[PDB]
């Protein structure tokens, strides 16, 4: 019976894990929870309901907002920074606050009179907000925010990607962005950015998102990964790469994870063939971050020094979003001197060449909504959640077709959140639907005390250590002694 947290009278939205302590933070409707690694409740903070209107500006009080009605507050963004928990709700134009780590109840910073540059998150629960935290070139913490388009109420003018200050000189300016700390993009309602994930590696921040390809008469949504330098607060280095899972046949990216050969990080992302109704199939596609960086680097080098062309002459780079910019023919010393650009280099760059992947696996009738990937004995294992509330486990090593070896219902009819995360040791996985959070062990080998039940509950982690009389992992079969893999059906007990 797995450990669970099922809060009554609320729905869940986001899960954030502190990598230094393991403490879990749970964003819910009108609630924030602080949980131990074993899902014990350490604090409960009420965030709503509040008086609000999407046509009113915070702080919302009756005199200046006569149309205000009581409004519930689904969490829109939940992120651990080195010194604080960043929290942005759906109410009050998506304004944010900072709370103390390990004492959620204590507020650290909440601007008293926030202005137009401090409306961070989408004010609509159905529009996603993604974020990531990073240290900036002045030593201070930065918050990258990808925010989708909102139509209803003031706040359709917020830039789709922004870089905001978490601890600026004046605390009251917290969460605001400088004038150039944004992706300057018009026709926001037409592109209609839908953000799926944001992550960092090395000196780069990455965004995964959907947006309309306005150069196609279909005006159809396409999946993109964009890279921007992680610390400068500028978008000079922004480069946009289209993603192609089976040529774009699986077009609507849903969820992703990064997993770890040096700098061998790979992005695993799930893609749906069909959009949700106003049938279909899902695929898992792998994009090694080194390949992501080479294409981004090649896009930049072509735009900077070869008028957007590769060394063979091919047009590979161009300027997006109808910005008055063009690629250039700068001296080649530019590439080592300004890897992240300047306020005069061509921007915002995009690649004509999509990043392509052949699906790891293709499942009909399943809409994958969550991805987490780990390794065991050098071989990839994927944990995948779907729109019906099921968690699937898939061995991706030699001998597999990509079909899951285990499928369990977390909650029937409630999609698994893309906020799937492992614990520090990769021994447990935290899985969340709209109403429940579970701590799931990645393997339960020890539960089997005879060889037959060990080998019968087929699991890539589990095998019978002969000279130990235990169902264990291969790493645990040593005092490397004989280990009967439960994932070798042609091999049985002795």
């Amino acid at each position: 019976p797995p450990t669970a947290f099922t809060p009554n009278g609320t729905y869940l939205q986001h899960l954030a894990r502190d990598p230094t302590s393991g403490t879990l933070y749970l964003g819910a409707t009108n609630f924030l929870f602080q949980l131990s690694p074993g899902l014990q409740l350490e604090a409960t903070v009420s965030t709503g309901p509040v008086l609000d209107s999407r046509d009113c500006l915070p702080p919302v009080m009756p005199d200046e907002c006569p149309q205000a009605q009581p409004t519930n507050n689904p969490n829109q963004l939940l992120l651990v920074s080195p010194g604080a928990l960043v929290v942005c709700g759906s109410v009050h134009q998506g304004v944010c606050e900072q709370r103390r780590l390990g004492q959620l109840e204590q507020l650290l910073l909440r601007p008293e009179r926030p202005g137009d540059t401090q409306y961070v998150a989408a004010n609509d629960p159905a529009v996603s907000t993604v974020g990531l935290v990073a240290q900036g070139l002045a030593g201070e913490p930065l918050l990258f925010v990808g925010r989708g388009y909102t139509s209803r109420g003031v706040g359709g003018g917020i830039p789709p990607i922004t870089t905001r200050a978490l601890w600026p000189p004046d605390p009251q300016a917290a969460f605001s962005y400088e004038e150039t700390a944004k992706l300057a993009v018009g026709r926001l309602s037409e592109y209609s950015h839908h953000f799926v994930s944001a992550f960092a590696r090395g000196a780069s921040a990455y965004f995964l998102f959907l947006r309309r390809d306005l150069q196609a008469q279909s005006r159809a949504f396409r999946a993109y990964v964009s890279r921007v330098c992680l610390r400068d607060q500028h978008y000079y280095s922004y480069v946009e790469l289209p993603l192609a899972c089976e040529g774009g046949r699986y077009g609507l990216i849903q969820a992703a994870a990064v997993a770890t050969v040096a700098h061998g990080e790979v992005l695993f992302a799930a893609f749906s063939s069909a959009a949700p109704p106003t049938s279909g199939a899902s695929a898992l596609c792998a994009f090694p971050l080194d390949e992501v960086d080479r294409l981004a680097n090649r896009t930049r080098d072509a735009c900077y020094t070869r008028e957007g062309r590769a060394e063979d002459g091919t047009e590979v780079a161009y300027i997006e979003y109808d910005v008055n910019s063009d690629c250039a023919q700068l001296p080649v010393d530019t590439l080592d001197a300004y890897p992240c650009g300047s306020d005069h280099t061509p921007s915002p760059m995009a690649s004509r060449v999509p990043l392509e992947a052949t699906p790891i696996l293709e499942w009909p009738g399943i809409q994958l909504t969550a991805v987490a990937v780990t390794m065991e004995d050098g071989h990839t294992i994927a944990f995948l959640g779907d729109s019906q509330g099921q968690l699937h486990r898939v061995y991706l090593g030699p001998g597999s077709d990509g079909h899951p070896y285990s499928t369990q219902s977390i909650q029937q009819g409630s999609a698994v959140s893309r906020d799937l995360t492992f614990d520090g040791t990769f021994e447990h996985l935290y899985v969340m639907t709209q109403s429940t959070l579970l701590k799931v062990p990645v393997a339960s080998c020890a539960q089997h005390l005879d060889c037959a039940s060990c080998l019968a509950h087929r699991d890539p982690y589990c095998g019978w250590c002969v000279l130990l009389g235990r169902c264990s992992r291969r790493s645990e079969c040593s005092r490397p002694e004989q280990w009967l893999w439960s994932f070798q059906p042609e091999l049985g007990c002795l």
Binding site: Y11, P125, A126, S128, Y149, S192, H194, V196, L210, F221, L252, Q254, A255, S272, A275, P276, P277, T278, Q367, T369, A370, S387, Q388, G389, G413, S414, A415, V416, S417, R418, Q434
Partner: peptide, 15 residues
């Protein structure tokens, strides 16, 4: 909701 819904998690949870 809206026809702007491309996420199946969003559809499951809010539509």
């Amino acid at each position: 909701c809206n026809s702007n819904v491309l996420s199946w998690q969003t559809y499951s949870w809010y539509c």
